[PDB]
Ligand SMILES: *[C@@H]1O[C@H](CO)[C@@H](O)[C@H](O)[C@H]1NC(C)=O
C-alpha cells in the first residue's frame with residue numbers, strides 16, 4: 151500500500167520484488183472463484199497524494 | 200420523531216400506542232388525495248444515530264451475546280471456592296514415594 | 298410504521314358528518330369547497346356546497362414482525378460459570394452458578 | 396394450489412391513481428406507486444403499486460405479464476417490458492399482486508415506466524431510498540469474496556403468514572365519456588356490462604341508477620349539467636387514498652401480502668489486514684482500507700477510553716497499551732487483543748546513574764516522586 | 767447534474783453529444799427539496815411556460 | 820491480413836464465468852468482466868470480459884456482432900445491441916477479442932448488459948472508476964475550446 155510496493159531493477163528485468171500482502175481467502179460454497187486479499191496499488195495512492 | 204414513537208406491549212398485541220403528530224391538511228382543488236402531516240419514523244432516525252453497540256463498548260473485555268441474553272468473558276473480580284472433600288480420598292505418605 | 302389512510306368520503310352537492318373512529322393516532326377532518334376530478338372527468342358537478350372527508354390513522358408496518366427492536370429492563374443479575382475441575386485425576390465438566 | 400397462489404387477485408382487480416408527473420403533467424394512471432419500503436439490508440426494494448400483476452385477466456397463473464387499468468378498459472403487457480430506475484436501471488426480481496421486488500441502486504426518487512401501444516408512460520414519486528450496507532464496512536455493491544454474517548433481507552418467496560392489509564369495495568367511479576347530447580338531450584350508455592349511476596343537480600329527475608337502458612334526459616341544456624358514475628360492486632380494492640370510498644357501506648377483510656422481510660445470510664467485504672508495528676507501551680497500526688471502514692478500539696481497564704472513527708484513506712495511528720489489556724477490532728476481521736509488558740530500558744544493574752532514568756520508564760506516575 | 771447529454775437512434779449506431787454546463791435548479795421555497803412533495807402549500811414561483819405563445 | 824487481425828480468436832473461443840448478480844441472483848454467464856483498467860486520462864475504459872468478439876463463429880472478420888457462450892451452445896448477436904453504463908450509459912468505441920474500449924463516465928461500478936432472445940441479462944462488478952482530468956483544471960467533460968497539452972490515452976488501434 152505504499153509507493154514502491156512493486157519494484158523492478160530495470161524495465162526489461164524479468165525478476166521483480168513484490169510486497170502486496172497477498173492473503174488467500176475461503177471460497178464461497180457452490181461457487182468457483184479464486185478469493186484473495188491485497189493492499190491497494192501504492193502507485194495509485196502516491197499518484198493521488 | 201423519537202425512538203419509541205410507535206410502541207406495542209407485545210408482538211402479538213393488537214392494541215398499540217402511537218404518537219406521530221398526525222395532522223390532516225387541505226387537499227388540492229381538483230385532485231383526489233388524502234393529505235397528511237407526520238413526524239419522520241423515529242425508528243429510522245435512531246437506527247441512523249444508534250451509536251456503537253454495548254458489545255463494543257462494554258468494559259473488562261466483556262462479550263455480549265443475544266437470544267439467551269448473557270455476558271461472557273468479563274474479566275473483573277475474583278470468586279471464592281470451598282471444597283468439602285472426604286478424608287477417604289486422601290492418600291497416606293507411606294503409599295507415595297519419599 | 299405505516300400511515301394507514303382511508304379512502305376519501307366525497308359527498309357531491311351536500312355535506313358529510315364526521316364520526317369517532319377507534320384507531321391509534323386516528324385523525325379525521327371535514328373539508329368544504331372541493332371540485333374533485335377523475336380520469337373520467339369532473340367527479341362532482343357543484344362548485345360549492347361540496348364536502349370531502351379525509352381520514353387517516355397510524356398502524357404497524359407489515360415488516361415489523363421480523364424487523365423490530367425490543368425494549369427490556371434488567372436487574373439483579375446472576376453469573377453462571379463453566380469450570381473444568383480435576384481433583385485427583387477426576388476430570389469433569391461442571392456447570393455451576395457463582 | 397392453495398389460496399396464496401389462487402390469490403385474492405380474483406376478488407381485487409387493479410386500479411388507477413394520480414401520479415405527480417406522467418411526463419407532460421399529472422394523470423390518473425394505474426402505474427402509481429402507493430408506498431415503498433427500504434428496510435432490507437441487501438438493497439432490494441419492495442414497491443406497492445396501484446396495479447396488480449402475476450395473474451392474468453382470467454385469473455390464471457402467469458408471471459410473465461402485468462395488468463394495468465387503461466382508463467375504461469384493462470390491458471395487459473409482458474412484465475419484461477416494464478422497467479424502473481432510481482439513479483440507474485433496476486433489476487426486477489419477482490412480483491405478486493400489488494407488490495414488486497426489485498434490485499434498485501441508491502437514489503433520491505423511484506421512477507417506473509413501461510411501453511404502451513403509444514408514447515411510453517412513466518411516474519416518479521419522492522421517497523428517500525438509502526440501503527444500509529451489511530456489516531461494519533460501507534460498500535456500494537457486495538464484494539466478490541468475503542465472510543458470512545447475519546442480515547435481514549426481503550424474501551422472494553410468495554409464502555405469507557404474518558403480514559396482512561385491509562381491502563374494501565371501491566366508491567363510485569365517475570366517467571364523463573358515458574354521457575353525450577345525442578341530438579339535444581343527455582344520453583348515457585350503461586354501457587353493456589356496467590351499471591350506470593347518473594344524478595343531476597338541476598330539477599326534474601335527479602336519480603337514475605340505470606342498470607342497462609339508453610335514456611334521454613330533458614331540462615339539461617349541456618352534457619356538463621349532468622354527472623355519471625360507473626358502479627361495479629363486484630370486486631374489492633386496496634384502501635387507496637386517491638379513489639373515493641363508497642358511502643353506503645365498507646365491506647372489508649384481511650388479506651396477506653408477499654415479500655416478507657426475513658433473516659438470512661449476506662456476503663460482506665473483509666477489512667484489509669493492517670500492518671502491526673510493536674513498541675514500548677504502544678502499537679503502530681498501518682491502515683489501508685479498500686472502502687470506508689469503521690475502526691473501533693477499547694481498553695480492558697475500568698476506563699475504556701472508547702475511540703472510534705470511520706477511516707477511508709490510508710493513515711497510521713498509534714495507541715497506548717497497558718498491561719491491563721487492549722482490544723483491537725478492524726472492520727469484519729475477528730477481534731484481536733494485545734497486552735503489553737516491560738519493553739525497555741527496564742531496570743538493569745547499571746551502576747551508577749543510568750538505572751535512575753531506566754526506572755523512570757518502569758512504573759510511571761510517581762518514580763520522580765520518590766526521587 | 768453536471769452536464770447534459772442528448773442522444774437519438776439513427777438508422778445505424780446511436781449518436782450522442784455532451785456539452786459542459788452547470789445545471790442546478792433552486793428548489794421553490796425555503797426548504798431545499800430534490801423532487802416536489804405529494805402535499806404542500808401553494809407559493810409563488812417562476813417557471814418556464816410550455817405555451818408556444 | 821497478418822496474425823493480429825487473424826487473431827488467436829480461432830484458437831481461443833469465448834467462455835463463461837460467474838457474475839455476482841445476474842438480475843435475480845448469481846449465474847455462470849459469458850458476460851462476466853475479468854478486469855477493468857482506468858489509466859487513460861481521457862476517460863475511456865478498457866474492459867476485459869470472459870467472452871470474445873470482433874470475429875464470428877467461423878473466424879471471419881465481423882466487428883458488427885459479439886460472441887457469447889450460451890450454456891451448452893454458442894450464440895452471436897449484433898454488437899450495437901450490447902449496452903453498458905456506470906452512472907450514465909456508456910459509448911462503445913471499439914473491441915477486439917476479450918477486450919472492450921468504451922467512453923464511460925465516472926461511477927462506482929460498471930454494469931454491462933445485452934438483450935438475448937429472452938429477458939435481458941446484465942452483470943455488475945465492483946471496481947473504482949475515477950479518471951483524472953487532463954491538466955491542472957478538474958473538468959468533467961472536455962471543453963469545446965482549449966489549449967493542446969500532452970496526455971496518455973488508450974489507442975483504439977488494434978496494432
Ligand atoms: C478441560 O476442558 C477442556 C474442554 O472444555 C478439555 O479439552 C481439557 O482436556 C480439560 N482439561 C482437564 C485437565 O480436564
Ligand SMILES: *[C@@H]1O[C@H](CO)[C@@H](O)[C@H](O)[C@H]1NC(C)=O
Pocket residue numbers: 672673674677678679712713
Ligand atoms: C506514532 O506517531 C508518530 C507521529 O504521529 C510517529 O512519528 C511514530 O513513529 C509513531 N509510532 C510508531 C511506533 O510508529
